[PDB]
Amino acid sequence: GKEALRANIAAVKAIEEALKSTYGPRGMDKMLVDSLGDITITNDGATILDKMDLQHPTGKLLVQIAKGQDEETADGTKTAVILAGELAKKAEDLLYKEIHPTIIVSGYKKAEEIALKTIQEIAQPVTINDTDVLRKVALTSLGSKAVAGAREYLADLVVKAVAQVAELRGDKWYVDLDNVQIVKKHGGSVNDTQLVYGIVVDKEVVHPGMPKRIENAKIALLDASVEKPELDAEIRINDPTQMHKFLEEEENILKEKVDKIAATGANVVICQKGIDEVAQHYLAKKGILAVRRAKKSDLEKLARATGGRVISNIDELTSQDLGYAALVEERKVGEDKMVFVEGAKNPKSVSILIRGGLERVVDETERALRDALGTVADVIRDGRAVAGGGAVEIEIAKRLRKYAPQVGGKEQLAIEAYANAIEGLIMILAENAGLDPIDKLMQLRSLHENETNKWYGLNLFTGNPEDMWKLGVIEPALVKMNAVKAATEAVTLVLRIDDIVAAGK
Amino acid sequence: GKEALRANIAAVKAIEEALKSTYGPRGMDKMLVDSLGDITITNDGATILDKMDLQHPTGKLLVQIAKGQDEETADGTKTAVILAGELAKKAEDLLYKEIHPTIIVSGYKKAEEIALKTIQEIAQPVTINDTDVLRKVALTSLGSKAVAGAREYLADLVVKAVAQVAELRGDKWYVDLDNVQIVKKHGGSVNDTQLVYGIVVDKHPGMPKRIENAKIALLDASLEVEKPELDAEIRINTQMHKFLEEEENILKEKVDKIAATGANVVICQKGIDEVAQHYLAKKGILAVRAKKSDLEKLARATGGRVISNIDELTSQDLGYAALVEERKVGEDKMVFVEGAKNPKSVSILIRGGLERVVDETERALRDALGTVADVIRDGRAVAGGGAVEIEIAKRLRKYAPQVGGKEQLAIEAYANAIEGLIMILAENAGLDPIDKLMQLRSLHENETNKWYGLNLFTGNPEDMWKLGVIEPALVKMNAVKAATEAVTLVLRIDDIVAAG
Amino acid sequence: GKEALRANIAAVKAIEEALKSTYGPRGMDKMLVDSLGDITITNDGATILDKMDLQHPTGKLLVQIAKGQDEETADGTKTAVILAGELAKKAEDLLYKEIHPTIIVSGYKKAEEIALKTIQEIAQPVTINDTDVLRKVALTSLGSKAVAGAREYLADLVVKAVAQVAELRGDKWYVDLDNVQIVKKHGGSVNDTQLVYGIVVDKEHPGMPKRIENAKIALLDASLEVEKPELDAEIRIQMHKFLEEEENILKEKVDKIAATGANVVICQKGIDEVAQHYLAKKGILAVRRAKKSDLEKLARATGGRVISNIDELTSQDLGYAALVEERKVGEDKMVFVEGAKNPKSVSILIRGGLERVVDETERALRDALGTVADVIRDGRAVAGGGAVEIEIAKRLRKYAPQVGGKEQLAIEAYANAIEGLIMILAENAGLDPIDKLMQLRSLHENETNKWYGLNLFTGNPEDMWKLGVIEPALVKMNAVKAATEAVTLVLRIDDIVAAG
Ligand SMILES: Nc1ncnc2c1ncn2[C@@H]1O[C@H](COP(=O)(O)OP(=O)(O)O)[C@@H](O)[C@H]1O
Ligand SMILES: Nc1ncnc2c1ncn2[C@@H]1O[C@H](COP(=O)(O)OP(=O)(O)O)[C@@H](O)[C@H]1O
């Protein structure tokens, strides 16, 4: 049974070894070449674990635990898995001393609970009012990613965008990120990006003859597409003057189809099907704006943000169901055109237009932005925040070291190992920064003899212990707290296994 | 993760090694034999990277970065990729000293920013007025290419041609190269080439071949008949005989509509029906059998609009010209739309004895146009021939001490990597690289002699500016940015994982 | 001819690699097991190169150059050979750039001359008066060795001892270390050691006076044994009287010497046991075989002459002393000739608990004597700990630009090779070499902080001069000359041809 655990532990350390390079802001990236041939370079753990497949089932479960977090932000996964790795690494050293795993687990459980407690007790509170901090958080979150052009601009836009959707529910701050629309274009600098308080539709209008500007536009959201009379009736013809009139009836059918909708009268209509090129002219004749196939995602985000309902059947329409907007417009941002539904009736209306010079590079800003949104939303929803840069881990360590003596012997060693495994993560951080890990970590914890200097962490640039909070190195209290729970979960779920009997074939 | 970086760096140095031969005016060429069998010899990096395919993805991204320069000219790509190569070469030596890559990147970033600053501060300003300089620039740009016959003539024509399109937009000089038409013929010397201030079209004997004050009708419709086959299979039962004439009357009805306004020249991008020829020739109208490119360039340059549908015609929207003519330049004939209404109207007729050789002048000319356009749009220019790099080097060497230690070494390496490029230049010239570079930088103890660079012919350090060795300040500046970009984007990778 | 140079350079780097561990105060030691079986641990380069034999002739010449330093102290040899190593290491990198060796040599020559100049210009003057500094120097010199017990005591005794022998010759301070006597005993602490201003004889009849006042010393370099009549005459057995004649011969031998009447006699031969009683009968002190070394040191220090023949004696030749005594220092007894007539009279008694350990203090003391003597004779001293090398480096880096190109690179390489030595120092101290060196040179932007060097204990750049880290200006200066000598004498060789 020891070889099986050795195998599983090896499996974990393999992942830790894979990701260890990418940890920290001054980390390393990994390239991934699609079978198609498309190249994708990244350090974001979610994408790495995604594209990098594993055959070892414990690996699949491990990734399932680390990656499969409840939260929208992929931030904290790397931290969790690396920690799991370190825990397993020390665990091995505990096993070498002839300690039955259940003991190690029990010690790790105490250690995790107290880690959480230690995070709780130190976690400085933060209010949505203290906007600058939220900007610092956004900065820290998005800064770590490959793109570093105009971080301040983006972070600013992030905080401003997030603060808009937030609402008081039972005096508790609730936020729904589905309320934020996110659209992408190719070409253009990073500065050319802009937020919109209305709903943006990434499309070109169906006809040049339509009004491209409507004031106080009401929006009709129709999820309907011709009729086929072949199976209904064999279209037999032997007399040529007959069919000619048979034709016009079928156009009159379409007219009958559209007239119903023309009766109530819409200002703008959007459907998720290829628009027939005759309806264009008839809709253009009335002075109505239309759009070609937009995806259901934007339609559903349009639905709640406009104060209307999306309608499956075009015959069941009611005059209340249709959304209401203040301004609709179309414009050229960069080279291509886009549609903009500005000043929607719903107060929690937000959109963001993103742009990158290269089509593959703009995708990084997406993955960098999503986390920058979520991470801040998680600061808002929680109401606590903590200075990263190693200011946390060492406190957990010193805590567990001070607590370990008075837990009884065999757990104590597991707890101490836990503390060392927590500490070693900062060393991993420093390794990636090119500095001496030991020297710096010891320097750090040696500076924590004073409780005032609790926020002191390593700056990977100066290479010197400095106050992380003042330097704008803040992170969410929760996202870093969950990493410990997922990591402990994983390691315990590795040490809890004795053998595998998987069914091949 | 070290082996992956070694592989990528190797991948870069492979490209550097491929191109290193072709760098500089006195460089080497590379032959490329098409699968068809056609042979193509060239040194132009774009074509080399084009025809030479790479399987290594980092290579594809590398070429994507180097080629993927914002500007119209392929000039500067070689410079960039070679520099990237040198940077990687020194980087290796930095890694051998146990320096984590992020440090190297940080140092290279500082080095790049300061390189740009150093280019900015020294870059002599240049105005469109100082035409001779622009000629010297054109010369330097086009001279490096395989063809060296009548460089002065061409450069002159280039500068004259470019200066015509330039316009003041918000007191800032804007230029659009789409305004320049470029047509090619086979056979004839290099001197027989000429520019035209009107629009040249590279294309019935009974039509008037000369029209005064011609109005040009731009018809993007098939002048061919309409096909009643799919419409109606016609069964023969003297009836069909008239069925014929109706169908000619259709064409007459088609043309008469267009004959309403009364235009003197018509052009369409479809095979012209041989009955419309006689009817159009009967009126005394000139016609032609042409690509949409020239039509779109004709559109804006004549003061008219290209017409999609022949039924929607208006009496405005046909272009206006002063003179139209046709002539034999060399063996074949060409059409010339001279004295267009739009002021920014330009065309150029190019000719080479051999059909494959005239294509080189094209690739040599495009860059010679862009390069000068980039001098105009920017408003700065710098003497090449190594006068730049050594200053960057000395700058970074003087700046490196006061940046902190571990960055300082990366910066110094950067400076050495910048310097080594001139050595590469000298290697291709057959001279001793070290001796000459050191000779150069040793002459820069005096700032007056800042423009001193190597002459590849005399082999002696001389003032490059006075010898007409000038280049655009921007195109050489972008190379550093793309090169740094690439190298950093190589050192930023730790491992690759392909799917399936 | 390239492979021969590669081999020789390899040969040098091998030695550098051998010694690199032992460099600096916080260095490493090396154990050496004699063929006899006796073990000897040491870091002192002289002993390492001694006991470690090399077959490669260039190695023998190399050690011959490094060891073969003009000066009394073995200090500076390691520094020299390591520097030679670094120079060769960079030289390799210069050769890789296709630079003919003579160029490298020329550059290294300029670099060496300017290194010497740079040492001259910065070298703070020091006078014999500023005794505390001399103590700091002694400390620095002796401190690096294995023994660290009671360094202050020893250094103090060193300075006091050396200052006594120094004499004004043409107003220039001359010192002769042959004037200092050095004797050793086994067992006893390091504190139990003491200096004596008279001449100490390390030796043991009980009937003789062991204390004489104002003793005149007779230096007899003749066998006090009988003369052998065996070869002269095989005697057949009267004999009883034949005996007494032969005692009367000894009496006749001694009486002659008893003429002047000296109080102490010393000879370097086993003393006949009959002369003992006759000499003891007069009330004279004698000693058993002492070595000629102490006799020659006794000769000049007592104001007398050593006598080859006992028949040529004169009443003036004999030395004069104020006090003679014998005493038990530790377990064994020793003879002490105190208050000699010659003013430059010095002796030192050294003692270690272990017989092998006391030998280290010897080798540590000799250098501590010489090193200070070299500060006195020169009149200059310099703060070690890296405060020197970085200045040489910055100097050569600032000077290199204006020497012409191909030399400039050799000079820069020299500077880097000088710098790298401190890194080697820091490596042995367990700290990061690069970081610390860069930290050092970055602190030298201010000239005031010129003496800043690395402290191997705090790990921080600090003023070496104030911390008592001073060394002789000359001994460190000669190392550069011997190192350059060696490296140039390696790069000057193209091939070797032996007689097989
Ligand atoms: N500006 C910063 N300065 C110092 N440390 C930072 C900074 N930003 C982030 N970190 C550190 O980076 C660690 C991990 O960040 P990163 O690897 O980019 O994402 P993740 O949190 O998913 O691992 C955190 O533990 C945090 O302490
Ligand atoms: N007449 C010249 N004298 C010296 N150097 C020149 C001259 N013309 C061009 N060069 C050098 O050639 C280099 C590159 O030119 P070339 O290889 O022909 O095209 P590209 O600009 O794409 O590299 C420039 O960096 C410039 O320094």
Ligand SMILES: Nc1ncnc2c1ncn2[C@@H]1O[C@H](COP(=O)(O)OP(=O)(O)O)[C@@H](O)[C@H]1O
């Ligand atoms: N106390 C000290 N602090 C710092 N450096 C020292 C000290 N003592 C000696 N050194 C350094 O040690 C180096 C070599 O000294 P050492 O090994 O003792 O003898 P040697 O000169 O024969 O190698 C010198 O370059 C000097 O700078």
